[PDB]
Symmetry: D2
Subunit: 59 residues, 4 copies
Amino acid sequence: SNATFGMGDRVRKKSGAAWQGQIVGWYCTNLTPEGYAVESEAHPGSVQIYPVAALERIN
Amino acid sequence: SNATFGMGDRVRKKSGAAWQGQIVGWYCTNLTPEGYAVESEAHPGSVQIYPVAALERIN
Amino acid sequence: SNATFGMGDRVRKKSGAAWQGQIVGWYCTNLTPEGYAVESEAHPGSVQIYPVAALERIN
Amino acid sequence: SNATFGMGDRVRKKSGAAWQGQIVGWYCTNLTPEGYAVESEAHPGSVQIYPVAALERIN
């Protein structure tokens, strides 16, 4: 839809705790109306979820 | 698609650590080809992710 | 030590995503020099970790 | 005590989702009577918690 990222985009956390890897899903709550699941590129199979504002796309 | 759950289904963990609330998203990795994000009904705003085999739908 | 909480204290998240239950552990990193593990009182066996500034003790 | 790992040990997940880095804390619940917090060596500041049986020490 108006989604910021798509499946397979490479993203990282902008600040604080680090995370980097591919978009592998999405979620939506009232607190986080646009959220993404990101599989680490360093730790295959490990997925963490974050609000869109915490993430930025990289090449 | 062939998805087991849809947005808004009420689910719980079958076993081990407990979790219960609404489906709020999805994710797919090689290790977890069908996964869901679940917002707790007890702890609004807190979301955890699980493979489909760990979850069951409730009324 | 100078720890803010002890094992068994009942705590909750102050803001944002909710969580409530007993202190069940601790952790320390450069980003989070004083952190706690909290077992949900609603979802037995489910544990989440947070920095001390995110938590407050309740009766 | 009878703890398997100490602060600063380098550990990894044995199987499934990967994780690797230093022990930075501990937790204890009925479901997980001996658990550890592990800071990723790849993603500084990101910590995940696991039961002792899921982890093994490495050099």
